[PDB]
Amino acid sequence: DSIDDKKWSKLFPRIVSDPDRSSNFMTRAIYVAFSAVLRNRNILGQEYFTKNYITEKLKCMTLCFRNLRSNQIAQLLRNAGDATKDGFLKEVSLVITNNEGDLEAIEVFSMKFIYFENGGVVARLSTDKNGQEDPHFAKLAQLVYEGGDSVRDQMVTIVRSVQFLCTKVLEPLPEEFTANFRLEYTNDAPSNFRIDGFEDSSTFYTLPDDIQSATIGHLRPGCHAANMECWSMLMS
């Protein structure tokens, strides 16, 4: 059970069935997906991205480690991704607003997470706030790890969907906007736990009532699960 793609090996682990690499793939997952989103929505210019292979089928622009700014943003997502190791990360989302730092978003690219108790089969419960089941829970809990190649296809689906939404579906962003990364901790995460680069906040983000959405794709490595969605006012 391994991903034998020659290109895949550079950015990703060849094996995603064990806890460490399952969590590590997620970190690499966050990095690639949000790189494509930032690039294809033209939040950042080309010069912050390095052309990379995901598979022999698909290329992608990933945040450049050799540019000052893009390296900071890559580091930011790497910290968020590392929190996946102990099940401390509920959600990371690229949040676009009119002004820094509005609560209600114009557009949001969200990755939402779920962790599994042991063997990577039974899902750890993820709740409100009020005790209510999380919106992204059911869909991800029903899933079963189907091998490394299934995960490879999921990563390809996500990046291709990201490219599709920005190229064919989404209206352009305004001349003036502010885009920042906002995350949510799991309840399991202790008070002593904080993710570098992210300020503590009592507020997250909100969406207008008339918000439209689209599913970018899901991820099911051996011991983790994620769903990526696009929320925006600029569809069609």
Partner: peptide
């Protein structure tokens, strides 16, 4: 130290 469930990063502004 942290009594809040949310994290905010510095952003990119155009």
């Amino acid at each position: 130290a942290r009594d809040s469930p949310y994290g905010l990063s510095q952003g990119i502004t155009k």
